[model samples]
Target: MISVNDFKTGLTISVDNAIWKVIDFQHVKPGKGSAFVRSKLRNLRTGAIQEKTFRAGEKVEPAMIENRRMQYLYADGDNHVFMDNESFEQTELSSDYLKEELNYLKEGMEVQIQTYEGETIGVELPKTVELTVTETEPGIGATKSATVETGYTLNVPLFVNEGDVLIINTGDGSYISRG
Candidate 1:
């Protein structure tokens, strides 16, 4: 169990029958009223964020969320498979919870998976990855661009052409550095 005063970024707690991670927090001490803790909590399983306020001494449940570093193997049927680089163990997850995540994941990509009681609930992709430009139109004069199957279109240097690999940010699908 944890108290409202213990709220901090990256701390997970059970609230309203769901597990939530504190994304941000602010402790307010007003001039005439009780001090309270205001927080922005993100749902670990659904990627939903909510702003909540609590008294200074309110009680909250501490939840244990297991995180593992795994490499994405492939998709089979309705399941996505991952390999544990350390133990060589394989874990399969349903696509229902990974639909949005699939957009940023590619073969052999490293990711962090959050699980509860051995059940997979959410996936976190690496912030940046290197991908090859498989398709793109030629640069007219000064603007050079490329597109990948993952729906990333980025402007590159004039020298960058198709078939060249580049680094991209997964969070916003923006270009980062050239390969």
Candidate 2:
């Protein structure tokens, strides 16, 4: 169990009988009667966001999320396949929770498989990745949108060119550099 006073970003806690990841944990809101914490949380299973108010001294159960290193194998029609690095086990994942993540993923890429209570929730992507630019257009500004081999289009510096391998930040899918 943990106290609301110990709340921080990316904290996983069990509240309202469901596991949630804290997106934002604003400090005490001066109240007329009692102290409370304003928090923004996302449902770990459904990726739903909700704002919840907790009494300042309230205690909550901390949820354990398991992270395992895995390798992206290939697509199996509607599902994507991954292999566990240690046990060599395979898991077929649905695309429902992987919509935005598919943009940065590629075949044979190593990623961390995040799970909760034996369920594969999603992947913990690396901080950055190297992707080859498939196409680019002339830009008049400092940055322009370029399509990568995975079809993920993101803004890169104006000097980026086709076939250039770029270091892209996986967190926000932003371009870092070409070297």
Candidate 3:
């Protein structure tokens, strides 16, 4: 059990028997009546996000989640296979759950897997990752930049060109250091 006042980003709580994770929150005093908390929450199972408000001093149910470190193995058709580094156990996950992170993920990369009821539903990667620019159009004179095949639209340095590697943030697709 957790209090609504204790809500923080990435904190998981149980609401109406569904697991909800806090993505963003703000405490408001409103300059008048009582204090309350406004939060943006995402459903762990369905990947749904919703905004919710709660009065201060209210209590909320905290979910019991288990996180494990896993390594990517290979893609088996529509499902991506992963192995538990500690146990060597393998599990296949749906492509839908890993859609956005696929571009940043490479074989043998460490990832965080979240499971509820013994079923894997969510995967998280590092904030920033490096990937090669497999193919892209040639940059004009002053408009030199490379595009990676990761599906993310990253703006490389002015001197960057195809075949050069670049680093990107998996969270927002922002360009980072170069490789």
TM-score of each: 0.64, 0.65, 0.65
Q: Please tell me which model should have the higher TM-score, number 1 or number 3.
A: 3
Better of 1 and 3 by lDDT: 1
lDDT of 2 at 21: 90
Candidate 2: regions farther than 4 A off: 1-15, 20-64, 138-141
Superposing all C-alpha atoms, what RMSD in Å does each candidate have to the true structure?
5.0, 6.2, 6.3
Residue 6 C-alpha lDDT in model 3? 66
Task: Show model 1 residue runs off by greater than 4 Å.
Answer: 1-11, 21-61, 94-96, 140-145, 149-159
Select the stronger candidate by lDDT from 1 and 2.
2
Candidate 3 lDDT tens digits, 4-88: 5566788888776678989999988778977788989998888888888887677876777888999999888888899998999
Which pairs of residues collide in model 2?
Answer: none
Tens-digit lDDT track of model 2 for 1-179: 77766777898888887789999878775757556679999998788999998886677778999888999999888799999899999988877868888888889889888888877676787788888998998544567889998889988888777889999998878888896
Model 2, residue 5: what's the lDDT?
A: 68
Q: What is the C-alpha lDDT of each candidate?
A: 0.79, 0.84, 0.78
Error of 1 at 24 (Å): 10
The lDDT of model 3 is 0.78
After the best TM-score superposition of candidate 2, give how far the Cα of residue 6 lies from its true spot, in angstroms: 16
Better of 2 and 3 by lDDT: 2
